[PDB]
Design a protein around this motif. Structure first.
Motif, mmCIF file in Angstrom:
data_model
loop_
_atom_site.group_PDB
_atom_site.id
_atom_site.type_symbol
_atom_site.label_atom_id
_atom_site.label_comp_id
_atom_site.label_asym_id
_atom_site.label_seq_id
_atom_site.Cartn_x
_atom_site.Cartn_y
_atom_site.Cartn_z
ATOM 1 N N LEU A 1 7.094 -0.186 7.103
ATOM 2 C CA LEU A 1 6.688 1.179 6.778
ATOM 3 C C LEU A 1 7.891 2.084 6.561
ATOM 4 N N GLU A 2 7.952 2.744 5.405
ATOM 5 C CA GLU A 2 8.936 3.784 5.159
ATOM 6 C C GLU A 2 8.215 5.032 4.669
ATOM 7 N N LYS A 3 8.934 6.135 4.657
ATOM 8 C CA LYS A 3 8.395 7.343 4.081
ATOM 9 C C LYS A 3 9.419 7.880 3.111
ATOM 10 N N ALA B 1 0.842 -1.189 0.000
ATOM 11 C CA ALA B 1 0.000 0.000 0.000
ATOM 12 C C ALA B 1 0.879 1.241 0.000
ATOM 13 N N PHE B 2 0.278 2.377 -0.355
ATOM 14 C CA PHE B 2 0.982 3.645 -0.214
ATOM 15 C C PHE B 2 -0.025 4.779 -0.071
ATOM 16 N N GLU B 3 0.435 5.875 0.535
ATOM 17 C CA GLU B 3 -0.407 7.040 0.782
ATOM 18 C C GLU B 3 0.438 8.293 0.611
ATOM 19 N N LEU B 4 0.005 9.178 -0.283
ATOM 20 C CA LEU B 4 0.783 10.336 -0.703
ATOM 21 C C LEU B 4 0.195 11.608 -0.106
ATOM 22 N N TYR C 1 -4.072 6.117 6.588
ATOM 23 C CA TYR C 1 -4.112 4.672 6.385
ATOM 24 C C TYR C 1 -3.280 3.942 7.433
ATOM 25 N N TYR C 2 -2.112 4.481 7.774
ATOM 26 C CA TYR C 2 -1.208 3.812 8.697
ATOM 27 C C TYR C 2 -1.421 4.224 10.149
ATOM 28 N N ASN D 1 10.418 19.604 7.223
ATOM 29 C CA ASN D 1 11.355 20.721 7.298
ATOM 30 C C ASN D 1 11.518 21.425 5.956
ATOM 31 N N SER D 2 10.705 21.062 4.968
ATOM 32 C CA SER D 2 10.586 21.794 3.717
ATOM 33 C C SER D 2 9.196 21.520 3.164
ATOM 34 N N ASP D 3 8.760 22.359 2.223
ATOM 35 C CA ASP D 3 7.585 22.010 1.438
ATOM 36 C C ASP D 3 7.912 20.767 0.624
ATOM 37 N N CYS D 4 7.070 19.741 0.720
ATOM 38 C CA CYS D 4 7.518 18.436 0.251
ATOM 39 C C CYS D 4 6.336 17.553 -0.117
ATOM 40 N N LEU D 5 6.652 16.477 -0.830
ATOM 41 C CA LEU D 5 5.761 15.341 -0.994
ATOM 42 C C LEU D 5 6.242 14.209 -0.093
ATOM 43 N N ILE D 6 5.292 13.525 0.544
ATOM 44 C CA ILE D 6 5.566 12.446 1.490
ATOM 45 C C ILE D 6 4.781 11.221 1.049
ATOM 46 N N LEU D 7 5.485 10.133 0.749
ATOM 47 C CA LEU D 7 4.839 8.862 0.434
ATOM 48 C C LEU D 7 5.079 7.898 1.591
ATOM 49 N N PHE D 8 4.042 7.667 2.400
ATOM 50 C CA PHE D 8 4.038 6.553 3.341
ATOM 51 C C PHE D 8 3.777 5.274 2.558
ATOM 52 N N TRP D 9 4.619 4.254 2.741
ATOM 53 C CA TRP D 9 4.451 3.052 1.935
ATOM 54 C C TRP D 9 4.965 1.822 2.669
#
Length: 162
Positions: free
Chosen positions: A94-96, A49-52, A65-66, A79-87
């Motif tokens: 679980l990693e990000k 699974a993943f969640e963005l 989800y997690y 610590n910055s404007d960012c995209l984060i994928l929990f997966w």
């Protein structure tokens, strides 16, 4: 390159990702916000699974989800404007994956490996150690989480393909 949007549909069918490379693109949001998810309704550690998310610098992003998992990586302090994928996939609990949001649009690239496997790709320019810089260029392969599971879309998005 066809670029269409903003789309407001809440579901992208898995079958619409299997024939070509697909960019899922977002204008830079004004605050942290969940963008999309692929996975069952409730967390299932046996399935991939993943969640963005989009994360605004200086805020805390907590996966939905997690949220029933016990793992350091279920939140991210941006610590910055960012995209984060929990997966999660395979033996990975679980990693990000975090990439910095460098422009006024950002997102992910989905490359079909076959009708039931996708490569998710993310990239961005980041700094670490203060004045060290890195072009992060990341990907991971995910099988379809389970039969019938599509992509939940939680904010308006742009679609780019050929």
């Amino acid at each position: 390159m066809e670029i269409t949007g903003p789309h407001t549909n809440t579901v992208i069918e898995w079958s619409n990702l299997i024939n070509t490379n697909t960019w899922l693109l977002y204008q830079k949001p004004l605050n942290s916000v969940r963008l999309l998810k692929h996975g069952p309704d409730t967390y299932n550690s046996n399935l991939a699974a993943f969640e963005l998310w989009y994360g605004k610098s200086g805020t805390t992003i907590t996966s939905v989800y997690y949220n029933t998992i016990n793992n350091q990586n279920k939140t991210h302090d941006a610590n910055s404007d960012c995209l984060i994928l929990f997966w999660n996939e395979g033996s990975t609990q679980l990693e990000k994956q975090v990439v910095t949001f460098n422009w006024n649009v950002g997102g992910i690239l989905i490359k079909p490996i076959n009708s039931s496997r996708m490569r998710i790709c993310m990239s961005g320019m980041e700094n670490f150690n203060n004045d060290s810089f890195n072009w992060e260029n990341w990907n991971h392969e995910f099988p379809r989480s389970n039969p019938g599971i599509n992509i939940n879309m939680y904010t308006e998005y742009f679609l780019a393909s050929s």
